[PDB]
């Protein structure tokens, strides 16, 4: 279901990205960032634009924001376009 079942350290599925997203979450951000690949010079793949602006969901913004810095990216701006704040029920 959601990503906070009871998993933490020392648990059977591997220790990973745990987001505070509810059941079928409907909140999503509008993020903007550059993310240079830092791996094209030994792979020699084709090049793709690294400056992107896209709507990521609340269910997986934290994983994406945690990963964009993994590969040296810089986050220029993020906002919560869709969803409420301090909302107990209704994020579903």
């Amino acid at each position: 279901a959601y990503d906070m079942d009871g998993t933490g350290a020392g648990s059977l599925e591997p220790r990973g990205i745990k987001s505070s997203a509810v059941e079928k979450d409907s909140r999503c951000f509008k993020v903007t960032f550059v993310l240079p690949s830092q791996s094209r010079l030994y792979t020699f793949r084709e090049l793709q634009n690294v400056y992107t602006t896209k709507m990521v969901p609340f269910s997986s913004w934290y994983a994406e924001q945690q990963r964009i810095q993994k590969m040296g990216g810089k986050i220029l701006k993020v906002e919560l376009v869709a969803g409420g704040q301090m909302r107990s029920v209704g994020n579903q």
């Binding site: 350290a9 220790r15 990205i17 010079l41 030994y42």
Partner: protein, 160 residues
């Protein structure tokens, strides 16, 4: 450096450094000054060594020095010693931060396409570093040159 590899390698698993890794930082920091004492030995012999590198890279490869080769001319040979100076300067960085990243984030990653767009034969540069390692053995005693030996042949492995 080596601590940076442990912080990074422990960070993609979302955990603190384990028992073995903290050895790898602790043992690295206890051998600290000996890298510091060693790099000052090499910095005082940079004019020592690159003069000896130009000895054998060109008696081995007179193709490059001759008229028509890339290194023909004064100003082409002028930077020729500069590339030795930057490489030797990079190795002092690698000898200090006890790993290969300063030899890899600089110098190694994409070096062939740099030289291939310059006309420098990439095989000749491999012998240049091999020449440079051959030159460092004379101004260095047997104790500490095998400390610096594995940092040289990584460059040769990186260039092939």
């Amino acid at each position: 450096s080596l601590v940076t590899q442990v912080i990074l390698s422990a960070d993609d698993e979302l955990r603190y450094p384990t028992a073995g890794e903290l050895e790898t930082i602790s043992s690295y920091l206890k051998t600290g000054e000996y890298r510091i004492r060693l790099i000052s030995i090499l910095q005082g012999k940079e004019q020592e060594i690159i003069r000896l590198a130009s000895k054998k890279i060109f008696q081995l490869h007179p193709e490059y020095i001759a008229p028509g080769g890339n290194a023909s001319g004064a100003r082409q040979r002028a930077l020729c010693l500069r590339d030795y100076g930057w490489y030797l300067r990079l190795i002092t960085y690698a000898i200090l931060a006890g790993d290969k990243e300063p030899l890899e984030k600089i110098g190694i990653i994409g070096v062939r396409e740099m030289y291939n767009s310059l006309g420098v034969p990439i095989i000749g540069m491999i012998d240049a570093i091999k020449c440079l390692k051959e030159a460092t053995v004379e101004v260095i005693s047997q104790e500490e040159e095998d400390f610096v030996a594995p940092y040289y042949d990584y460059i040769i492995q990186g260039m092939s």
